[PDB]
Design an enzyme around this catalytic site. Structure first.
Site, mmCIF file in Angstrom:
data_model
loop_
_atom_site.group_PDB
_atom_site.id
_atom_site.type_symbol
_atom_site.label_atom_id
_atom_site.label_comp_id
_atom_site.label_asym_id
_atom_site.label_seq_id
_atom_site.Cartn_x
_atom_site.Cartn_y
_atom_site.Cartn_z
ATOM 1 N N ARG A 236 40.867 56.963 61.800
ATOM 2 C CA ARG A 236 41.928 57.870 61.384
ATOM 3 C C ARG A 236 43.192 57.727 62.219
ATOM 4 O O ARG A 236 44.193 58.385 61.918
ATOM 5 C CB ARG A 236 41.432 59.318 61.429
ATOM 6 C CG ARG A 236 40.087 59.515 60.753
ATOM 7 C CD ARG A 236 39.528 60.901 61.008
ATOM 8 N NE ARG A 236 38.165 61.030 60.508
ATOM 9 C CZ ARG A 236 37.849 61.246 59.238
ATOM 10 N NH1 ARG A 236 38.779 61.370 58.306
ATOM 11 N NH2 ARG A 236 36.567 61.341 58.895
ATOM 12 N N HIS B 159 25.846 46.102 41.350
ATOM 13 C CA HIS B 159 26.120 47.531 41.361
ATOM 14 C C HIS B 159 25.547 48.156 40.095
ATOM 15 O O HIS B 159 25.947 47.782 38.985
ATOM 16 C CB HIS B 159 27.623 47.798 41.465
ATOM 17 C CG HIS B 159 27.961 49.182 41.925
ATOM 18 N ND1 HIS B 159 29.072 49.461 42.691
ATOM 19 C CD2 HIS B 159 27.334 50.366 41.727
ATOM 20 C CE1 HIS B 159 29.115 50.757 42.945
ATOM 21 N NE2 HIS B 159 28.072 51.329 42.371
ATOM 22 N N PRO B 160 24.600 49.086 40.218
ATOM 23 C CA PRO B 160 24.009 49.712 39.023
ATOM 24 C C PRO B 160 25.074 50.382 38.169
ATOM 25 O O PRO B 160 25.791 51.277 38.623
ATOM 26 C CB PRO B 160 23.023 50.736 39.598
ATOM 27 C CG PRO B 160 22.938 50.489 41.060
ATOM 28 C CD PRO B 160 23.876 49.405 41.460
ATOM 29 N N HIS C 119 38.572 58.866 47.806
ATOM 30 C CA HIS C 119 39.107 59.585 46.655
ATOM 31 C C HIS C 119 40.520 60.101 46.895
ATOM 32 O O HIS C 119 41.330 60.122 45.963
ATOM 33 C CB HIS C 119 38.180 60.744 46.287
ATOM 34 C CG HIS C 119 36.873 60.309 45.703
ATOM 35 N ND1 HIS C 119 35.792 59.952 46.482
ATOM 36 C CD2 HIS C 119 36.471 60.174 44.418
ATOM 37 C CE1 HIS C 119 34.783 59.614 45.700
ATOM 38 N NE2 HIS C 119 35.168 59.740 44.444
ATOM 39 N N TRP D 173 44.142 72.420 57.556
ATOM 40 C CA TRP D 173 42.914 71.665 57.218
ATOM 41 C C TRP D 173 41.838 71.967 58.255
ATOM 42 O O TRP D 173 40.754 72.422 57.852
ATOM 43 C CB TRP D 173 43.239 70.177 57.085
ATOM 44 C CG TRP D 173 42.124 69.192 56.928
ATOM 45 C CD1 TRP D 173 41.541 68.447 57.907
ATOM 46 C CD2 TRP D 173 41.532 68.760 55.693
ATOM 47 N NE1 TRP D 173 40.595 67.616 57.375
ATOM 48 C CE2 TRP D 173 40.566 67.790 56.018
ATOM 49 C CE3 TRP D 173 41.703 69.120 54.354
ATOM 50 C CZ2 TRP D 173 39.776 67.178 55.050
ATOM 51 C CZ3 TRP D 173 40.925 68.511 53.397
ATOM 52 C CH2 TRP D 173 39.977 67.553 53.742
ATOM 53 N N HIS E 34 17.972 56.681 36.010
ATOM 54 C CA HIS E 34 19.318 57.253 35.987
ATOM 55 C C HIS E 34 20.205 56.527 34.975
ATOM 56 O O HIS E 34 20.823 57.155 34.099
ATOM 57 C CB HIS E 34 19.907 57.180 37.399
ATOM 58 C CG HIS E 34 21.208 57.901 37.572
ATOM 59 N ND1 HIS E 34 21.379 58.891 38.516
ATOM 60 C CD2 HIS E 34 22.406 57.762 36.955
ATOM 61 C CE1 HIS E 34 22.619 59.341 38.462
ATOM 62 N NE2 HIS E 34 23.263 58.673 37.524
ATOM 63 N N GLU E 35 20.252 55.197 35.060
ATOM 64 C CA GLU E 35 21.088 54.426 34.144
ATOM 65 C C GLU E 35 20.551 54.476 32.718
ATOM 66 O O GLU E 35 21.331 54.450 31.758
ATOM 67 C CB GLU E 35 21.197 52.981 34.630
ATOM 68 C CG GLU E 35 21.785 52.848 36.029
ATOM 69 C CD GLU E 35 23.208 53.359 36.123
ATOM 70 O OE1 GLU E 35 23.956 53.234 35.131
ATOM 71 O OE2 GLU E 35 23.581 53.890 37.190
ATOM 72 N N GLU F 151 26.913 62.892 34.455
ATOM 73 C CA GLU F 151 26.152 62.599 35.663
ATOM 74 C C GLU F 151 25.074 63.636 35.969
ATOM 75 O O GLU F 151 24.341 63.472 36.948
ATOM 76 C CB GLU F 151 27.100 62.471 36.858
ATOM 77 C CG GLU F 151 27.652 61.074 37.089
ATOM 78 C CD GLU F 151 26.669 60.186 37.829
ATOM 79 O OE1 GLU F 151 25.883 60.720 38.639
ATOM 80 O OE2 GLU F 151 26.681 58.958 37.612
#
Ligand SMILES: *[C@@H]1O[C@H](CO[C@@H]2O[C@@H](C)[C@@H](O)[C@@H](O)[C@@H]2O)[C@@H](O[C@@H]2O[C@H](CO)[C@@H](O)[C@H](O)[C@H]2NC(C)=O)[C@H](O)[C@H]1NC(C)=O
Ligand SMILES: *[C@@H]1O[C@H](CO)[C@@H](O)[C@H](O)[C@H]1NC(C)=O
Ligand SMILES: *[C@@H]1O[C@H](CO)[C@@H](O)[C@H](O)[C@H]1NC(C)=O
Ligand SMILES: *[C@@H]1O[C@H](CO)[C@@H](O)[C@H](O)[C@H]1NC(C)=O
Ligand SMILES: *[C@H]1O[C@H](CO)[C@@H](O)[C@H](O)[C@H]1NC(C)=O
Ligand SMILES: *[C@H]1O[C@H](CO)[C@@H](O)[C@H](O)[C@H]1NC(C)=O
Ligand SMILES: *[C@H]1O[C@H](CO)[C@@H](O)[C@H](O)[C@H]1NC(C)=O
Ligand SMILES: [Zn+2]
Lengths: 596, 195
Positions: free
Chosen positions: A151, A327-328, A487, A459, A356-357, A384
């Site tokens: 950071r 990568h699934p 993100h 924060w 899951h998939e 999801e």
């Protein structure tokens, strides 16, 4: 020709000129994910450019059948999807600059390099390196060094360019006719027109803050237990009266607490159902794993998988001859084409990821009859949720005993079932407050309630009130800590995970009640239950054709979201936590700095 | 028997589009539906008006042959009392139909990796389709109330659209070669039938 018979048509031509162009882009992307070569990149670029040009042309042509005169909630959702001036309301000299901002942020985040306050040769990047040093290390100074270094170098070079993103994105939000950019993101939870099912944009603000209240008692006890167990790991570093340093959570940003299982294991010396040895013993392979799963979903009444999935879907790593992105991912190319891309290995984790998939493909297959624009989840938190309820259903010891992975005695003693609950809680309970904190901070660092000079003073005050973490060393204003996350640096909504978590348990409890299950909820297997499968399908089929309120009510019977189903999943763990927290302190003081 | 080209219709190198809809008069020999039951499994054998075996034993005045290829999920629309894109805007079947419908997959023949855009079907029509009637015409169809002068553009649309078949499509989108047979009676003496 009512503007309802000039929009009925427009969409008929859109539904046919969109399918071909989406299929050609999906095929190009699949080919690039099969071979990482030079020609495949060019094919992807051409297909994506053509698709984007068609989308822009249709969006420009759309706005012409005004909103207020359509009356067919369906022909109107499609218009909402097409009529939408995202970043085209800005001047030509501003959109390019904004795209430059996003590209620079992505490049800076991807090409991270800390280097050491010593030998100027080693320059450990994020993945691997820093993620590894935060995952399997027990030192204190080393973890503090990594946490501050990431950071320091990355954080400084990302704010001057975040401060300019928080101006252009807001100004664009004011232009496309919205209150603010946070209000822009809280737009897929907005439903208007249908009586009794409305959900205002600001209603989610109250709903989230009302649901996180009925969680504090469980997360507080979990935090107290984790702190008590972390006392012995780091003796003269954590005080019982208050918070835990943010660089001692096994995750780089504290999103998940999974890596603390080896340090906080309850009744240890009692392993968890690991059938990996039986995989090698009984000669199990990827094809048999995927066959086993088609069998779970045919038990609950849902359909089989076309031969195209069997013929055109890679399931094992080809080797050194080809280069594929392991990568699934569940692929819905459209026009009856469904594929799953994953490099399968003989493990229980891959066994659950396959389910899951596979649940992802069954949802996608469910709404194949809907128009092109409505072929998606009811919101950003339903696709999801039924990819993860099936993992919970398959992970049950009863299901594993019915297919031949455990010796058919496996006394289900209460000693080991509680180790599964705590491990499962370290990835669910420990991430909701973090998500709520981050989303609340982002939401108000846009409405102008936090003036710039205070961006990083609020924060670290929110992370000492909402969550139980504290910064190791002081950070002045010139830092930018949230932008270190993947993100935040990119443009992705982050509130979807909270809704996913609180919807999956509602769905699980509803299906288990529909399956005549008796006993604790975590011992529930939904196999051999046609009623549960029918109840899910009646929701999987609609997609976006109806408001998510009705879709949720069709399964759980509740009008809106609830946290009770999830606190009923954790009742034994909660009672045990209260049992072992009598002699400890529950709660924290927002004033213990690991730096005076 | 004279062996009518029941093996030139159900056996050709290329058919026409959904909206053309060719038609040979056959009616020249003894019916030989034995080969019809052969030649690969069928996605649908749905004679309405008679029964399979029962046939090869009925005097029909005229048996019109009709050929075209469509996608899998739209095969069910070739039937009386059905409303759909093909039924409303392409070939129509009367509510009192009496004949057989023969369909079988043709992915290997009528599909290309790049895409097959040689088969065309109409999507919009300013009116409906009467029974056993064709309509070929490229006249642009006006959505709004401003006439167009035959130029694409605002509320202006070209009718017939292309399929774009590819081998990796699903069962509902793969090409399905369909032949539908006709059975009507006339005052002329019946001669085209077996002993
Ligand atoms: C799901 O059911 C199958 C089939 O069992 C049949 O259907 C049930 C609803 C019930 O009526 C049973 O009595 C029927 O036999 C189960 O597969 C069988 O499991 C038993 C377990 O003792 C085993 O002896 C059989 O050999 C299995 N038959 C097979 C594999 O063809 C399956 O175990 C059930 N799933 C569960 C319980 O999770
Ligand atoms: C909405 O439009 C569709 C397509 O024209 C139509 O089938 C449907 O009935 C309309 N919805 C209602 C129930 O008004
Ligand atoms: C589904 O798949 C299984 C295993 O591949 C097969 O045995 C079964 O017949 C299939 N069922 C249906 C209805 O397609
Ligand atoms: C498990 O059950 C035993 C038997 O009643 C009980 O004494 C014990 O407190 C329970 N908890 C564990 C996991 O030890
Ligand atoms: C790459 O791999 C795919 C899948 O096997 C193959 O079909 C294709 O022809 C290959 N392309 C190249 C670049 O050789
Ligand atoms: C944005 O596009 C044009 C730009 O002038 C505008 O007329 C239109 O109303 C806007 N679209 C919206 C906000 O729906
Ligand atoms: C015609 O071609 C088809 C397709 O290959 C074949 O099955 C059939 O036997 C041929 N018969 C003729 C020559 O009519
Ligand atoms: Zn998923």
């Amino acid at each position: 020709s009512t503007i309802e018979e000039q929009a009925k048509t427009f969409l008929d031509k859109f539904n046919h000129e969109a399918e071909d162009l989406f299929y050609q882009s999906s095929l190009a992307s699949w080919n690039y994910n099969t071979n990482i070569t030079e020609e495949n990149v060019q094919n992807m670029n051409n297909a994506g450019d053509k698709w984007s040009a068609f989308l822009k042309e249709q969006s420009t042509l759309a706005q012409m059948y005004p909103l207020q005169e359509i009356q067919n909630l369906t022909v109107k959702l499609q218009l909402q999807a097409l009529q939408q001036n995202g970043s085209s309301v800005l001047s030509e000299d501003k959109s390019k600059r904004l795209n430059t901002i996003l590209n620079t942020m992505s490049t800076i985040y991807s090409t991270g390099k800390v280097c050491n306050p010593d030998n100027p040769q080693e320059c450990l990047l994020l993945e691997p390196g820093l993620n590894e040093i935060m995952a399997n290390s027990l030192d204190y100074n080393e973890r503090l060094w990594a946490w501050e270094s990431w950071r320091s170098e990355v954080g400084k070079q990302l704010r001057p360019l975040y401060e300019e993103y928080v101006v252009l994105k807001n100004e664009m939000a004011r232009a496309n006719h919205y209150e603010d950019y946070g209000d822009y993101w809280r737009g897929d939870y907005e439903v208007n027109g249908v009586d009794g099912y409305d959900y205002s944009r600001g209603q989610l603000i109250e709903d989230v803050e009302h649901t996180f209240e009925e969680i504090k008692p469980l997360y507080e006890h979990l935090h107290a237990y984790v702190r008590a167990k972390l006392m012995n790991a780091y003796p003269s570093y954590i005080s019982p009266i208050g918070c835990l340093p943010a660089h001692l959570l096994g995750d780089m940003w504290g999103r998940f607490w999974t890596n603390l299982y080896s340090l906080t294991v309850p009744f240890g010396q009692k392993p968890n159902i690991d059938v990996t040895d039986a995989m090698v013993d009984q000669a199990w392979d990827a094809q048999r794993i995927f066959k086993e799963a088609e069998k779970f979903f045919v038990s609950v009444g849902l359909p089989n998988m076309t031969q195209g999935f069997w013929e055109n879907s890679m399931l094992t790593d080809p080797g050194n001859v080809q280069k594929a992105v392991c990568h699934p991912t569940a692929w819905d190319l459209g026009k009856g084409d469904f594929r799953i891309l994953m490099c399968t290995k003989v493990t229980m984790d891959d066994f659950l990821t396959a389910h899951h998939e596979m649940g992802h493909i069954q949802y996608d297959m469910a709404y194949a009859a809907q128009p092109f624009l409505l072929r998606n989840g009811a919101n950003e938190g339903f696709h999801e949720a039924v990819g993860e309820i099936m993992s919970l259903s398959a992970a049950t010891p009863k299901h594993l005993k019915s297919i031949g992975l455990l010796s058919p005695d496996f006394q289900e003693d209460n000693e080991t079932e509680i180790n599964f609950l705590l491990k499962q809680a370290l990835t669910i309970v420990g991430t909701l407050p973090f998500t709520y904190m981050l989303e609340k901070w982002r939401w108000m660092v846009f409405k102008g309630e936090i003036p710039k000079d205070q961006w990083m003073k609020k924060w670290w005050e929110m992370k000492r009130e909402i969550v139980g973490v504290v910064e190791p060393v002081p950070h002045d204003e010139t830092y930018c800590d949230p932008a270190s996350l993947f993100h935040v640096s990119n443009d992705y909504s982050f509130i979807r995970y909270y809704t996913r978590t609180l919807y999956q348990f509602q769905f699980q409890e509803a299906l288990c009640q529909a399956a005549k299950h008796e006993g604790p909820l975590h011992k529930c297997d939904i196999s051999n239950s046609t009623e549960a499968g029918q109840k899910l399908f009646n929701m999987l089929r609609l997609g976006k054709s109806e408001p998510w309120t009705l879709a949720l009510e069709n399964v759980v019977g509740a009008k809106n979201m609830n946290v009770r189903p999830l606190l009923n999943y954790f009742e034994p763990l909660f009672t045990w936590l209260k049992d072992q927290n009598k002699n400890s302190f529950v709660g924290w003081s927002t004033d213990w700095s690991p730096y005076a | 028997t004279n062996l009518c080209p029941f093996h030139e219709v159900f056996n050709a190198t290329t058919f026409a589009s959904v909206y053309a809809w060719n038609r040979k008069r056959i009616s020249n020999c003894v019916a030989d539906y034995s080969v019809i039951y052969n030649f690969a499994p069928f996605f649908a054998f749905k004679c309405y008006g008679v029964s399979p075996t029962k046939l090869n034993d009925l005097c029909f005045t005229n048996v019109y042959a009709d050929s075209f290829v469509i996608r899998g999920n739209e095969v069910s629309q070739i039937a009386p009392g059905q409303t759909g894109n093909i039924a409303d805007y392409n070939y129509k079947l009367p509510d009192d139909f009496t004949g057989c419908v023969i369909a079988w997959n043709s992915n290997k023949l009528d599909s290309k990796p790049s895409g097959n855009y040689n088969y065309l079907y109409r999507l919009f029509r300013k009116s409906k389709l009467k029974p056993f009637e064709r309509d070929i015409s490229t006249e642009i169809y006006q959505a709004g109330n401003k006439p167009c002068n035959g130029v694409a553009g605002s509320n202006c649309y070209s009718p017939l659209q292309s399929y774009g078949f590819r081998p990796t499509y699903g069962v509902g989108h793969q090409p399905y070669r369909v032949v539908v047979l006709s059975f009507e009676l006339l005052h002329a003496p019946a001669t085209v039938c077996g002993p």
